[PDB]
């Protein structure tokens, strides 16, 4: 199963990702950073305010269709 996730940037822009429930979200982080032209390690990705790990899957985080991921600068 795939779901569509909405990634909201620091500037309120959006990129949506169709991601398999078993795919490690590292792959989404890499794609987003590539498209923003910044290093992946300059960013932190949050779901419901909690940090998304490289090896988190959407299934592990209980994500559903049209759930939101927020991107902030790394601290």
């Amino acid at each position: 199963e795939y779901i569509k996730l909405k990634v909201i940037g620091q500037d309120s822009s959006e990129i949506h990702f169709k991601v398999k429930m078993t795919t490690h979200l590292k792959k989404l982080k890499e794609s987003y950073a590539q498209r923003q032209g910044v290093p992946m390690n300059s960013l932190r990705f949050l779901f419901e305010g909690q940090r998304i790990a490289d090896n988190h899957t959407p299934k592990e985080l209980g994500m559903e269709e049209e759930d939101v991921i927020e991107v902030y600068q790394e601290q």
Binding site: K4, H16, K18, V19, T23, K27, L28
Partner: peptide, 12 residues
């Protein structure tokens, strides 16, 4: 901005 949907492949 237009809608942007990226398909993430299953290969890692």
């Amino acid at each position: 901005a237009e809608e942007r949907v990226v398909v993430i492949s299953s290969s890692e």
